[PDB]
Design an enzyme around this catalytic site. Structure first.
Site, short mmCIF file in Angstrom:
data_model
loop_
_atom_site.label_atom_id
_atom_site.label_comp_id
_atom_site.label_asym_id
_atom_site.label_seq_id
_atom_site.Cartn_x
_atom_site.Cartn_y
_atom_site.Cartn_z
N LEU A 58 89.56 72.61 -44.27
CA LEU A 58 88.38 72.97 -45.11
C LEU A 58 88.61 73.91 -46.04
O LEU A 58 89.33 74.97 -45.73
CB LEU A 58 87.28 73.20 -44.17
CG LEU A 58 86.91 72.43 -42.97
CD1 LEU A 58 85.82 72.89 -42.21
CD2 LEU A 58 86.71 70.70 -43.41
N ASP A 64 60.37 84.42 -48.29
CA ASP A 64 59.58 85.16 -49.12
C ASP A 64 58.86 84.26 -50.32
O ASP A 64 58.92 83.17 -50.06
CB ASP A 64 60.47 86.22 -49.82
CG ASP A 64 61.57 85.63 -50.65
OD1 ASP A 64 61.72 84.53 -50.67
OD2 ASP A 64 62.20 86.51 -51.02
N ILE A 119 67.75 99.84 -46.95
CA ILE A 119 69.00 100.74 -46.43
C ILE A 119 70.24 99.66 -46.62
O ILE A 119 70.07 98.70 -45.97
CB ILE A 119 68.69 100.95 -45.07
CG1 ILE A 119 67.39 101.69 -44.61
CG2 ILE A 119 69.96 101.65 -44.47
CD1 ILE A 119 67.19 102.48 -43.32
N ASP A 134 58.73 84.09 -54.46
CA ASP A 134 59.30 84.12 -55.70
C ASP A 134 58.41 83.54 -56.67
O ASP A 134 58.41 82.29 -56.67
CB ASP A 134 60.63 83.50 -55.67
CG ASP A 134 61.33 84.33 -56.75
OD1 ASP A 134 60.98 85.42 -57.37
OD2 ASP A 134 62.11 83.50 -57.54
N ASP A 182 57.87 88.55 -54.95
CA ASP A 182 58.55 88.92 -56.11
C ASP A 182 57.64 88.28 -57.34
O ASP A 182 57.39 87.19 -57.34
CB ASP A 182 59.96 88.73 -56.34
CG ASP A 182 60.76 89.71 -55.13
OD1 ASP A 182 60.33 90.66 -55.07
OD2 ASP A 182 62.10 89.17 -54.87
N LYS A 202 91.90 83.29 -35.92
CA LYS A 202 90.83 83.67 -35.34
C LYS A 202 90.17 82.57 -34.43
O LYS A 202 89.49 82.83 -33.41
CB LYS A 202 89.67 84.47 -36.04
CG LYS A 202 90.20 85.67 -36.52
CD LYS A 202 89.18 86.35 -37.54
CE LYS A 202 89.57 87.80 -37.62
NZ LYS A 202 90.85 88.07 -38.39
N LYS A 236 91.55 74.53 -41.05
CA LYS A 236 92.15 74.98 -42.08
C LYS A 236 92.03 74.10 -43.40
O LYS A 236 92.04 74.44 -44.62
CB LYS A 236 93.57 75.41 -41.94
CG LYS A 236 94.26 76.23 -43.16
CD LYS A 236 95.31 77.11 -42.69
CE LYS A 236 95.78 78.15 -43.57
NZ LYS A 236 95.98 77.21 -45.01
N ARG A 284 59.77 84.47 -40.76
CA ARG A 284 59.68 83.46 -41.88
C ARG A 284 58.39 82.85 -42.14
O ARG A 284 57.48 83.25 -41.33
CB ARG A 284 60.40 82.06 -41.49
CG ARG A 284 61.93 82.62 -41.27
CD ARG A 284 62.94 81.31 -41.28
NE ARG A 284 62.47 80.33 -42.49
CZ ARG A 284 63.20 80.44 -43.52
NH1 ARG A 284 64.10 81.37 -43.65
NH2 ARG A 284 62.96 79.57 -44.69
N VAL A 325 66.91 96.96 -42.23
CA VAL A 325 65.94 97.72 -43.02
C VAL A 325 66.04 97.38 -44.59
O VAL A 325 66.91 97.81 -45.14
CB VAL A 325 65.58 99.15 -42.86
CG1 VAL A 325 64.37 99.61 -43.51
CG2 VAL A 325 65.71 99.47 -41.13
NA NA Z 1 68.91 96.59 -45.94
NA NA Z 2 91.47 75.91 -46.43
#
Ligand code: NA
Ligand code: NA
Length: 327
Positions: free
Chosen positions: A56, A184, A100, A186, A248, A66, A54, A143, A97
């Site tokens: 951090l 990718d 999507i 660019d 791209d 959690k 916490k 990759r 995908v």
């Molecule tokens: Na997607």
């Molecule tokens: Na914090």
DNA sequence: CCGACGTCGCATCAGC
DNA sequence: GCTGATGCGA
DNA sequence: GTCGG
């Protein structure tokens, strides 16, 4: 930092992040979990408690709790449950995908379409992008080794110069920073004839030539300033063919080119540090321009930029190599 | 307590 | 057919 | 979900 340190925690947070974005459609919770996973993945100690985590920045009350549950039980009851939910896990998977998103994924699963096999049996329910994303699902999640990126750069720079020797092309991203692999390619493109205060074919002609030599294989989207598509290195004779890659290409006015190059070179953490500075020195740096403020806070006109160094000079940092731009 | 959490190009949909 | 909104990826 | 004004 080794994954074995706090990997169970960061994987947990990343998994929670994806369900927020893709299932709950709560994009801000998604980035909250991401940011928490990031600051923990950098933490050079094995976390003993939620309270420790916490401290951090990015870790709040709910995540600390959690982590407590995870450290004590080795699992998360909410995460275990949603993993087992057929509808939720299907929606979350379909978003892998390209094309999507959370909305399309929900609609598909609503009408019983849950798997890639399901997607392949329903072509006419997919738009052009989603079909391409489906076609190269496996390839896109791979990759790209830097050696292949260099081979890809060879072709791009060659064909671009061939169209017009006055073009300027720069491959940015982590590659420019010297990364060992990329997700990718660019490419940032400009031409002396194209400025902000200023043709409608400068981008097309480059795309067309890369198609003519069969480097570009598919098109996700293509306008006057931005191309998003698919490319592939030529097959090395009898050898196994290369995977299809995402590429791209964007056309940027000359006077905005090096702000663009700096921005899309990164890293994200570096960019935030750099423009934070930046603020303190009385300049505002975005993707496009660097502008001064301004005693009230009123931004003036964009300052002339002719190189990356120009930007560094305006705010009095010594120029740093792309390689040393992790932060 | 409650708003911010980048912004934008392109494809496509929703509405007129 | 045009205009603005939305989904998506970056 | 987290931070901060
Ligand atoms: Na997607
Ligand atoms: Na914090």
């Amino acid at each position: 930092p080794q994954e074995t340190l706090n990997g169970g925690i960061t994987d947990m947070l990343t998994e929670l992040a994806n369900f927020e974005k893709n299932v709950s459609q709560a994009i801000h919770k998604y980035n909250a979990y991401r940011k928490a996973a990031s600051v923990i993945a950098k933490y050079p100690h094995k976390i003993k408690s939620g309270a420790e985590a916490k401290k951090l920045p990015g870790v709040g009350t709910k995540i600390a709790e959690k982590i407590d549950e995870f450290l004590a039980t080795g699992k998360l009851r909410k995460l275990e449950k949603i993993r087992q939910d057929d509808t939720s896990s299907s929606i979350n998977f379909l978003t892998r995908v390209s094309g999507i998103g959370p909305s399309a994924a929900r609609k598909f699963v609503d009408e019983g379409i849950k798997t890639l096999e399901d997607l392949r049996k329903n072509e006419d329910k997919l738009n052009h992008h989603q079909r391409i994303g489906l076609k190269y699902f496996g390839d896109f999640e791979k990759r790209i080794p830097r050696e292949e990126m260099l081979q890809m750069q060879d072709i791009v720079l060659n064909e671009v110069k061939k169209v017009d020797s006055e073009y300027i092309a720069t491959v940015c991203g982590s590659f420019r920073r010297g990364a060992e692999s990329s997700g990718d390619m660019d490419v940032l493109l400009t031409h002396p004839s194209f400025t902000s205060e200023s043709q409608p074919k400068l981008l097309h002609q480059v795309v067309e030539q890369l198609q003519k030599v069969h480097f570009i294989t598919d098109t996700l989207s293509k306008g006057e300033t931005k191309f998003m598509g698919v490319c592939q290195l030529p097959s090395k004779n009898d050898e196994k063919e290369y995977p299809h890659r995402r590429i791209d290409i964007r056309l940027i006015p000359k006077d905005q080119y090096y702000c663009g190059v700096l921005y899309f070179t990164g890293s994200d953490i570096f960019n935030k540090n750099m423009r934070a500075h930046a603020l303190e020195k009385g300049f505002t740096i975005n993707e496009y321009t660097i502008r001064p403020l301004g005693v009230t806070g009123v931004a003036g006109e964009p300052l002339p930029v002719d190189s990356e160094k120009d930007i560094f000079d305006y705010i009095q940092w010594k120029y740093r190599e792309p390689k040393d731009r992790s932060e």
